[PDB]
Enzyme design. Sequence first.
Site, PDB file in Angstrom:
ATOM      1  N   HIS A   4     -11.173  27.230  34.402  1.00 13.08           N
ATOM      2  CA  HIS A   4     -11.210  27.818  35.738  1.00 13.08           C
ATOM      3  C   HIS A   4     -10.261  29.009  35.873  1.00 13.08           C
ATOM      4  CE1 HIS A   4     -13.266  24.397  38.270  1.00 13.08           C
ATOM      5  NE2 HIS A   4     -13.986  24.779  37.229  1.00 13.08           N
ATOM      6  N   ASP A   5      -9.256  29.103  35.007  1.00 10.60           N
ATOM      7  CA  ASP A   5      -8.370  30.259  35.081  1.00 10.60           C
ATOM      8  C   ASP A   5      -9.119  31.458  34.506  1.00 10.60           C
ATOM      9  OD1 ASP A   5      -6.293  32.054  35.271  1.00 10.60           O
ATOM     10  OD2 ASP A   5      -5.269  31.373  33.454  1.00 10.60           O
ATOM     11  N   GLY A  49     -10.027  36.613  34.480  1.00 11.93           N
ATOM     12  CA  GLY A  49      -9.472  36.387  33.158  1.00 11.93           C
ATOM     13  C   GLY A  49      -8.410  35.312  33.140  1.00 11.93           C
ATOM     14  N   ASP A 104      -5.204  34.654  33.396  1.00  9.10           N
ATOM     15  CA  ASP A 104      -3.984  35.274  33.904  1.00  9.10           C
ATOM     16  C   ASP A 104      -3.169  34.332  34.793  1.00  9.10           C
ATOM     17  OD1 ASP A 104      -5.699  34.946  35.990  1.00  9.10           O
ATOM     18  OD2 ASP A 104      -5.647  37.025  36.683  1.00  9.10           O
ATOM     19  N   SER A 146      -3.924  32.990  37.394  1.00 10.07           N
ATOM     20  CA  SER A 146      -4.082  33.264  38.821  1.00 10.07           C
ATOM     21  C   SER A 146      -4.381  31.972  39.576  1.00 10.07           C
ATOM     22  CB  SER A 146      -5.193  34.294  39.067  1.00 10.07           C
ATOM     23  OG  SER A 146      -6.465  33.816  38.660  1.00 10.07           O
ATOM     24  N   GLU A 184      -6.621  29.991  44.888  1.00 10.76           N
ATOM     25  CA  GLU A 184      -7.907  29.658  44.282  1.00 10.76           C
ATOM     26  C   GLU A 184      -8.102  28.150  44.335  1.00 10.76           C
ATOM     27  OE1 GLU A 184      -8.381  31.363  40.311  1.00 10.76           O
ATOM     28  OE2 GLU A 184      -7.365  33.168  41.021  1.00 10.76           O
ATOM     29  N   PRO A 240     -19.129  28.465  37.908  1.00  8.93           N
ATOM     30  CA  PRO A 240     -20.478  27.892  37.906  1.00  8.93           C
ATOM     31  C   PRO A 240     -20.489  26.545  38.628  1.00  8.93           C
ATOM     32  CG  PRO A 240     -19.454  27.501  35.813  1.00  8.93           C
ATOM     33  CD  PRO A 240     -18.561  28.482  36.547  1.00  8.93           C
ATOM     34  N   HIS A 254     -17.287  18.537  28.278  1.00  7.57           N
ATOM     35  CA  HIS A 254     -17.650  17.337  29.022  1.00  7.57           C
ATOM     36  C   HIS A 254     -17.754  16.129  28.105  1.00  7.57           C
ATOM     37  CE1 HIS A 254     -19.472  20.001  32.396  1.00  7.57           C
ATOM     38  NE2 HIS A 254     -18.173  20.066  32.334  1.00  7.57           N
ATOM     39  N   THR A 290     -18.061   8.132  24.443  1.00  5.31           N
ATOM     40  CA  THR A 290     -16.610   8.103  24.241  1.00  5.31           C
ATOM     41  C   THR A 290     -15.934   8.911  25.353  1.00  5.31           C
ATOM     42  OG1 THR A 290     -16.797   9.942  22.628  1.00  5.31           O
ATOM     43  CG2 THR A 290     -16.658   7.699  21.743  1.00  5.31           C
TER      44      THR A 290
HETATM   45  C1  HEM Z   1     -21.315  25.228  32.215  1.00  8.23           C
HETATM   46  C2  HEM Z   1     -20.719  25.172  33.514  1.00  8.23           C
HETATM   47  C3  HEM Z   1     -19.946  24.095  33.925  1.00  8.23           C
HETATM   48  C4  HEM Z   1     -20.123  23.432  35.088  1.00  8.23           C
HETATM   49  C5  HEM Z   1     -21.207  23.700  36.127  1.00  8.23           C
HETATM   50  C6  HEM Z   1     -19.080  22.437  35.174  1.00  8.23           C
HETATM   51  C7  HEM Z   1     -18.989  21.479  36.207  1.00  8.23           C
HETATM   52  C8  HEM Z   1     -18.009  20.464  36.271  1.00  8.23           C
HETATM   53  C9  HEM Z   1     -17.911  19.496  37.345  1.00  8.23           C
HETATM   54  C10 HEM Z   1     -18.851  19.403  38.556  1.00  8.23           C
HETATM   55  C11 HEM Z   1     -16.912  18.633  36.993  1.00  8.23           C
HETATM   56  C12 HEM Z   1     -16.437  17.430  37.807  1.00  8.23           C
HETATM   57  C13 HEM Z   1     -15.318  17.819  38.762  1.00  8.23           C
HETATM   58  C14 HEM Z   1     -14.896  16.674  39.668  1.00  8.23           C
HETATM   59  O1  HEM Z   1     -15.500  15.587  39.570  1.00  8.23           O
HETATM   60  O2  HEM Z   1     -13.965  16.867  40.473  1.00  8.23           O
HETATM   61  C15 HEM Z   1     -16.400  19.052  35.697  1.00  8.23           C
HETATM   62  C16 HEM Z   1     -15.405  18.372  34.957  1.00  8.23           C
HETATM   63  C17 HEM Z   1     -14.835  18.848  33.775  1.00  8.23           C
HETATM   64  N1  HEM Z   1     -15.224  20.030  33.126  1.00  8.23           N
HETATM   65 FE1  HEM Z   1     -16.839  21.135  33.477  1.00  8.23          FE
HETATM   66  N2  HEM Z   1     -18.270  22.480  34.047  1.00  8.23           N
HETATM   67  C18 HEM Z   1     -18.754  23.548  33.302  1.00  8.23           C
HETATM   68  C19 HEM Z   1     -18.144  24.031  32.129  1.00  8.23           C
HETATM   69  C20 HEM Z   1     -16.950  23.553  31.591  1.00  8.23           C
HETATM   70  C21 HEM Z   1     -16.198  24.213  30.543  1.00  8.23           C
HETATM   71  C22 HEM Z   1     -16.528  25.612  30.008  1.00  8.23           C
HETATM   72  C23 HEM Z   1     -15.115  23.422  30.266  1.00  8.23           C
HETATM   73  C24 HEM Z   1     -14.036  23.648  29.408  1.00  8.23           C
HETATM   74  C25 HEM Z   1     -14.230  24.012  28.033  1.00  8.23           C
HETATM   75  C26 HEM Z   1     -15.200  22.290  31.167  1.00  8.23           C
HETATM   76  C27 HEM Z   1     -14.351  21.182  31.118  1.00  8.23           C
HETATM   77  C28 HEM Z   1     -14.350  20.145  32.045  1.00  8.23           C
HETATM   78  C29 HEM Z   1     -13.550  18.941  31.923  1.00  8.23           C
HETATM   79  C30 HEM Z   1     -12.624  18.617  30.766  1.00  8.23           C
HETATM   80  C31 HEM Z   1     -13.811  18.154  32.996  1.00  8.23           C
HETATM   81  C32 HEM Z   1     -13.073  16.866  33.401  1.00  8.23           C
HETATM   82  C33 HEM Z   1     -11.891  17.245  34.287  1.00  8.23           C
HETATM   83  C34 HEM Z   1     -11.090  16.050  34.775  1.00  8.23           C
HETATM   84  O3  HEM Z   1     -11.444  14.903  34.432  1.00  8.23           O
HETATM   85  O4  HEM Z   1     -10.099  16.265  35.503  1.00  8.23           O
HETATM   86  N3  HEM Z   1     -16.306  22.393  32.013  1.00  8.23           N
HETATM   87  N4  HEM Z   1     -17.088  20.178  35.255  1.00  8.23           N
HETATM   88 CA   LIG Z   2      -7.628  33.649  36.358  1.00 17.74          CA
HETATM   89 CA   LIG Z   3     -16.467  11.952  23.926  1.00 14.80          CA
END
Ligand code: HEM
Ligand SMILES: [Ca+2]
Ligand SMILES: [Ca+2]
Length: 307
Positions: free
Chosen positions: A43-44, A49, A51, A53, A65, A140, A171, A226
């Site tokens: 998200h940063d 970028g 940074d 922020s 943010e 996104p 994920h 997992t």
């Molecule tokens: C492709 C677009 C993506 C969408 C639409 C998206 C959406 C989300 C959403 C809806 C959640 C749940 C938030 C919540 O329940 O409060 C989440 C969790 C998470 N996302 Fe994604 N995500 C995306 C890409 C990524 C990317 C690029 C990464 C990092 C490489 C990432 C890593 C994570 C992680 C590790 C969690 C768990 C966070 C936690 O348990 O605190 N996501 N994401």
């Molecule tokens: Ca930033």
């Molecule tokens: Ca896993």
Amino acid sequence: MQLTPTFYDNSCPNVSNIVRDTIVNELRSDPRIAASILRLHFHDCFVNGCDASILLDNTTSFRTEKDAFGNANSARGFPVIDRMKAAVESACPRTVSCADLLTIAAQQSVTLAGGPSWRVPLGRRDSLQAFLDLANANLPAPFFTLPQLKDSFRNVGLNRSSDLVALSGGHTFGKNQCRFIMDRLYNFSNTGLPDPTLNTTYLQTLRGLCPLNGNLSALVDMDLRTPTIFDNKYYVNLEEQKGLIQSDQELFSSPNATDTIPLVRSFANSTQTFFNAFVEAMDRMGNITPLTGTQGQIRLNCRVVNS
Ligand code: HEM
Ligand SMILES: [Ca+2]
Ligand SMILES: [Ca+2]
Ligand SMILES: COc1cc(/C=C/C(=O)O)ccc1O
Ligand code: NA
């Protein structure tokens, strides 16, 4: 002045170690912190970028943010970033930027969860402001279609479907709130029916965890195989229509997935292939419009600009 992994080898050669110890310690009381930290970095980087922020708190001049639709009551781990920042400031005063600190923290979180180990490029500097509107427009959403996901990545500079598929592998661990899948479970795209791309057996399980009119804040594991281990299981789930959110399953089931389907399968077949792609994609994301040289500053307190 490009980013380099050796940026702190002389000024703070123990920075990565300090970051790691802080996470190791936090993981005992909160086994979700690793996933949370990786998401903070994501998200940063997707907003002006990498940074730092996103780490800035509300000010009379700009909104934080943290109140963005994608961050509000979702993003977490901020106190942990302050802790490692304080520890690093003691070891090396006014040396490591919050932007770099968060990048290292994301990498170490991945490695600690069992993922690949590598040295991320460094030399990023901290922003002088936060960008709430930009976060609302650039981050996104889980309900995005594949074309929208691709557009969101391209918008910030990541053109490759490999970037999208590999980074979505984040994920492979962490949690997701019922709120983000309620539509897939009971009324997808106003069809009055569940999302057809969701495995029917898994649908029943998810409905049990997220009943209608239930607690929308309840948490569900992103990876049913997992939940806390960083591995390629996330892709195995997609092949079985077990991606948790719409944006996950779209990578394999979208009519526009001709290019992403082979990547999903490749990552599901080999951990090595996935890990290599993840590191490559992670470094590309970490290279998004960074402030360097004398641009921006070395924030002493990640929550506020220096004064
Ligand atoms: C492709 C677009 C993506 C969408 C639409 C998206 C959406 C989300 C959403 C809806 C959640 C749940 C938030 C919540 O329940 O409060 C989440 C969790 C998470 N996302 Fe994604 N995500 C995306 C890409 C990524 C990317 C690029 C990464 C990092 C490489 C990432 C890593 C994570 C992680 C590790 C969690 C768990 C966070 C936690 O348990 O605190 N996501 N994401
Ligand atoms: Ca930033
Ligand atoms: Ca896993
Ligand atoms: C100066 O402060 C610190 C140094 C380290 C070093 C770890 C290592 O060398 O493995 C860890 C934690 C600290 O707070
Ligand atoms: Na680039």
